[PDB]
JSON list of C-alpha atoms and ligand atoms in Angstrom, two decimals:
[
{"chain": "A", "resi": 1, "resn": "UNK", "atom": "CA", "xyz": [126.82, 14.15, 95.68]},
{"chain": "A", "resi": 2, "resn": "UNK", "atom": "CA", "xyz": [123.37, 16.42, 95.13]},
{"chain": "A", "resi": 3, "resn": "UNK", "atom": "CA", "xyz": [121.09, 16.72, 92.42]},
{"chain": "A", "resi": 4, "resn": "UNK", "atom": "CA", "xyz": [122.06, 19.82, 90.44]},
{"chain": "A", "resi": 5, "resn": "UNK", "atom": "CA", "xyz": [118.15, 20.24, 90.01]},
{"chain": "A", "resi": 6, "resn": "UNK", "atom": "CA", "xyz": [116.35, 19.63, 93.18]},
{"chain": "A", "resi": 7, "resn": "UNK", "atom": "CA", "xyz": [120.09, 19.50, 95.40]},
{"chain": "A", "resi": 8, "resn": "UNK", "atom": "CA", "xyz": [118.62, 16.45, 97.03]},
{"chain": "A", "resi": 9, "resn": "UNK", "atom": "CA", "xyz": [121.62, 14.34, 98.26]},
{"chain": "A", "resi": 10, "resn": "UNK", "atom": "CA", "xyz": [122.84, 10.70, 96.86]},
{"chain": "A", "resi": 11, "resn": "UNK", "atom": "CA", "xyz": [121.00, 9.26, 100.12]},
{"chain": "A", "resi": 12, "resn": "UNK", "atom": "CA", "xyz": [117.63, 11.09, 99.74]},
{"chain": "A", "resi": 13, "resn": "UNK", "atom": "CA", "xyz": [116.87, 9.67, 95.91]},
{"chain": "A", "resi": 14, "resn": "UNK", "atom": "CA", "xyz": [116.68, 6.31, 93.60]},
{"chain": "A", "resi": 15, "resn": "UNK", "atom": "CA", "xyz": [119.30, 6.98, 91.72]},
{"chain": "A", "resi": 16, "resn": "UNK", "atom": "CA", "xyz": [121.63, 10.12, 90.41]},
{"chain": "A", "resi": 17, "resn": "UNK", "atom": "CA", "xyz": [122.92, 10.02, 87.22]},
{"chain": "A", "resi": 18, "resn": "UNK", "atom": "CA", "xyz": [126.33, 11.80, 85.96]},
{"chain": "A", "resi": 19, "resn": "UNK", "atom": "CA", "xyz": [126.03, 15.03, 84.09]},
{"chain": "A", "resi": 20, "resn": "UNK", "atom": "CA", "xyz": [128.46, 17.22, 81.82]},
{"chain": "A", "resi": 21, "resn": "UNK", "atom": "CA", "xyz": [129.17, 18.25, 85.09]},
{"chain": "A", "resi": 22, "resn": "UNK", "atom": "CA", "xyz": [125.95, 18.45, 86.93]},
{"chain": "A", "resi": 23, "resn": "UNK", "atom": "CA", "xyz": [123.68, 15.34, 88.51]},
{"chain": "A", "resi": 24, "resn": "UNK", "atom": "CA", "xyz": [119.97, 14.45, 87.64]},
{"chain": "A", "resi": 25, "resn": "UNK", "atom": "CA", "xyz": [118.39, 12.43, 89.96]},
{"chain": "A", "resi": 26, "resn": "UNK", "atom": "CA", "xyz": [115.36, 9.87, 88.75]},
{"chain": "A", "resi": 27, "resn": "UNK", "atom": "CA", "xyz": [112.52, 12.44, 90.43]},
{"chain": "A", "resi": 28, "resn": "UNK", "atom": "CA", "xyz": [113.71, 15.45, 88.50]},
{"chain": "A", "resi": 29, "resn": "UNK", "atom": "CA", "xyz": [113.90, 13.09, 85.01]},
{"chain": "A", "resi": 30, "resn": "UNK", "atom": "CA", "xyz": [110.24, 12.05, 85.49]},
{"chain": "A", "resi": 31, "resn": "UNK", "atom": "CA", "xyz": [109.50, 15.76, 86.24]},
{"chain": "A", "resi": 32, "resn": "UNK", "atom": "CA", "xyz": [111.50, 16.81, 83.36]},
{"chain": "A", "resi": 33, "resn": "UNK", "atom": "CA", "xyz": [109.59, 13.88, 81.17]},
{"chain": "A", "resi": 34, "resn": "UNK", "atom": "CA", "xyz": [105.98, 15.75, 82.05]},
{"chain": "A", "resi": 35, "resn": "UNK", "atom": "CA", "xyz": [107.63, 18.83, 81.25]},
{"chain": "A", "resi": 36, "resn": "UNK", "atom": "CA", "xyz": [108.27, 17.69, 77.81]},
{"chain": "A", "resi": 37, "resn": "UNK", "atom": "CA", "xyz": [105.01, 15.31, 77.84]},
{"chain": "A", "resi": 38, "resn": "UNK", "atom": "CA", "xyz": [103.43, 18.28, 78.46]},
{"chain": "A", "resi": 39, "resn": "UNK", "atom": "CA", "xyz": [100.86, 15.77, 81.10]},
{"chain": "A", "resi": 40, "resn": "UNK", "atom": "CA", "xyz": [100.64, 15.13, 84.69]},
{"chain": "B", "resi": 1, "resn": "UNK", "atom": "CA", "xyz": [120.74, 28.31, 72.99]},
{"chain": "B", "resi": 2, "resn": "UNK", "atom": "CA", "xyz": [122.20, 24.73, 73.29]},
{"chain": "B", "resi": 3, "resn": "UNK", "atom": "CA", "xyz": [121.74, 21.51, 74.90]},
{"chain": "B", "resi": 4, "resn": "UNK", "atom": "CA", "xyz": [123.79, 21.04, 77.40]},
{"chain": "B", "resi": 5, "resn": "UNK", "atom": "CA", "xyz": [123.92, 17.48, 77.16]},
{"chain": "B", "resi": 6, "resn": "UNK", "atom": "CA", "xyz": [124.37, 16.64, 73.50]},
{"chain": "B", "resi": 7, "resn": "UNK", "atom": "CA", "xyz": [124.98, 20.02, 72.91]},
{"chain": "B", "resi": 8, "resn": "UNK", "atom": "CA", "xyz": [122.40, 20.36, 70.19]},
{"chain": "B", "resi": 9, "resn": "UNK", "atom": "CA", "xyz": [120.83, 23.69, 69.15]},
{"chain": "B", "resi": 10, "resn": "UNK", "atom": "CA", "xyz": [116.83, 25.20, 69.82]},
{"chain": "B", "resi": 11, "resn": "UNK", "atom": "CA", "xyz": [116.11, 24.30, 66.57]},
{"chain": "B", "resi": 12, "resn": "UNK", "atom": "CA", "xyz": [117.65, 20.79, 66.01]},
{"chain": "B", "resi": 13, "resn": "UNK", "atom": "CA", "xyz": [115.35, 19.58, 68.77]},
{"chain": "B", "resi": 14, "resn": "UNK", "atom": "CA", "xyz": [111.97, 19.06, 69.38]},
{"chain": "B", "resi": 15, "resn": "UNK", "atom": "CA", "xyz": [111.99, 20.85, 72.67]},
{"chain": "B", "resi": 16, "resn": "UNK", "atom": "CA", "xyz": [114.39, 22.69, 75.04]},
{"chain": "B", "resi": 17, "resn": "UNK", "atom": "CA", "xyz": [113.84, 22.59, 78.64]},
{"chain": "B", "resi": 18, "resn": "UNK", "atom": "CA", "xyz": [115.11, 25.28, 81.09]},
{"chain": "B", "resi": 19, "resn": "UNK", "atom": "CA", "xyz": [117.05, 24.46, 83.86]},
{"chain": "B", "resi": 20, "resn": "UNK", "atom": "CA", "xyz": [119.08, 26.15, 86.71]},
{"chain": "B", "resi": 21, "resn": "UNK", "atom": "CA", "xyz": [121.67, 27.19, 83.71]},
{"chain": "B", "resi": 22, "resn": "UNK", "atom": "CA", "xyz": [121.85, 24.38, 81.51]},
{"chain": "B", "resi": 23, "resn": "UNK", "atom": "CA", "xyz": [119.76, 23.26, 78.90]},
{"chain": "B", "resi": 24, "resn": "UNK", "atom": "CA", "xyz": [117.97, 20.04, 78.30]},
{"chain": "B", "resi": 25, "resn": "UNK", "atom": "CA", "xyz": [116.60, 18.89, 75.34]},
{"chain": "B", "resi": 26, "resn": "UNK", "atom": "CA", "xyz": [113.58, 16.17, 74.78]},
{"chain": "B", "resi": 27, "resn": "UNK", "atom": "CA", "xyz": [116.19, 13.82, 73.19]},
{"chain": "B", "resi": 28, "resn": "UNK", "atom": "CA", "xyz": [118.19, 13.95, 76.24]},
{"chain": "B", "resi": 29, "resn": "UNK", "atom": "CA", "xyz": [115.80, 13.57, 78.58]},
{"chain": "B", "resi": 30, "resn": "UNK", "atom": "CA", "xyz": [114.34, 10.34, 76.47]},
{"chain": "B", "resi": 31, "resn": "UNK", "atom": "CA", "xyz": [117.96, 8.59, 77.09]},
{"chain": "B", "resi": 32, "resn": "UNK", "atom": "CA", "xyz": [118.12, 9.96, 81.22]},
{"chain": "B", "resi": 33, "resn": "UNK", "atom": "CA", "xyz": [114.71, 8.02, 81.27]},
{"chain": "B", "resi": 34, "resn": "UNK", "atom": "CA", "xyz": [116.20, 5.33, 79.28]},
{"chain": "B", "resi": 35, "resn": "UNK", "atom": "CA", "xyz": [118.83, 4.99, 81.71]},
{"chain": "B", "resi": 36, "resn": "UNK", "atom": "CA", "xyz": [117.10, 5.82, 84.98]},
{"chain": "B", "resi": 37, "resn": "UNK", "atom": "CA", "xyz": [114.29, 2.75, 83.85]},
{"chain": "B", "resi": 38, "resn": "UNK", "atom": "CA", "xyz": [117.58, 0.42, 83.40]},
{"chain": "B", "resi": 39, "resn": "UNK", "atom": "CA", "xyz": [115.88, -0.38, 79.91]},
{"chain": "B", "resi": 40, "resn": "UNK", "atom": "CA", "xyz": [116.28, 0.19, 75.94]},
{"chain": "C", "resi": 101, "resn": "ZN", "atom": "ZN1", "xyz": [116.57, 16.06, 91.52]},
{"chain": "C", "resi": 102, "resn": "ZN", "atom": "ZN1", "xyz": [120.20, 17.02, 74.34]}
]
């Protein structure tokens, strides 16, 4: 299991949620959260 | 262009984030947080 967004593997990461299809791991949600937030 | 998690449309959203072929909108990426931070 590897984070459709970074491919970082269920080992390397907090936690990895369950996509459509596709994985999001808790790094690439807070990264996608500034994205959005528009901060750093 | 559509959400691929809720499948919601550029403009029923507030923003739509690119990703490596899917889409994520600010809505979904609220609830990921949501259930990343185990809280409501
Ligand atoms: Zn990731
Ligand atoms: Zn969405």
């Amino acid at each position: 299991l590897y984070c459709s967004f970074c491919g970082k593997s269920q080992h390397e990461v907090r936690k990895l949620i369950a996509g459509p299809s596709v994985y999001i791991c808790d790094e690439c949600v807070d990264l996608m959260n500034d994205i959005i937030r528009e901060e750093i």
